[PDB]
Amino acid sequence: KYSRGPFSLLEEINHFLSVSVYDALPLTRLEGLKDLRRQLELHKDQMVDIMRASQDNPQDGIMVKLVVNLLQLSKMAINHTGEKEVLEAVGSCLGEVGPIDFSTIAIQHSKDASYTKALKLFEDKELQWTFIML
């Protein structure tokens, strides 16, 4: 993983989200959650830099995206074998960010980019229904 150079806080969070793109079960994310918490608590000047960089487009902010991803992951962990272990790790990582002003009011859930492009490919209403059903 650490080939071609080390990772910064922004790169670590991007890697965490990219891994989070596909998640079979919430319990498999415990070690990644612990590593993310350690990285967040180790570097906060880089967190200030990230917040400053995301000022221009607060909607695409990395920190609010990470927070909503963690919240969705905790939602998916309800009523499972590793419910409390995942919840503790999520709370541990959310304690690092704290109540930062994200300059957003609307939570934007992650949406697949390929799905939207595939929908745009079809120009007929009947074809789109076929694609979605298949």
Residue number with CB closer to other proteins (17 or 94): 94
The closest alpha carbon to 38, from 13, 21, 17, 63, belongs to: 13
CB of 25 to other proteins, least distance (A): 16
CB of 66 to other proteins, least distance (A): 12
Binding site residues, other proteins, CB under 8 A: 44-45, 47-48, 51, 58-59, 64, 67-68, 71, 74-75, 78, 84, 87-88, 90-92, 94-108
Say how far residue 130 (Cα) sits from the centre of its chain: 30
CB of 1 to other proteins, least distance (A): 27
Residue number with CB closer to other proteins (107 or 118): 107
Q: What angle, 0 to 180 degrees and rounded to 10, lies between the N-to-C axes of helices 62-76 and 9-20?
A: 40
Say how far residue 96 (Cα) sits from the centre of its chain: 15
Q: Are 26 and 76 in contact (CB under 8 A)?
A: yes
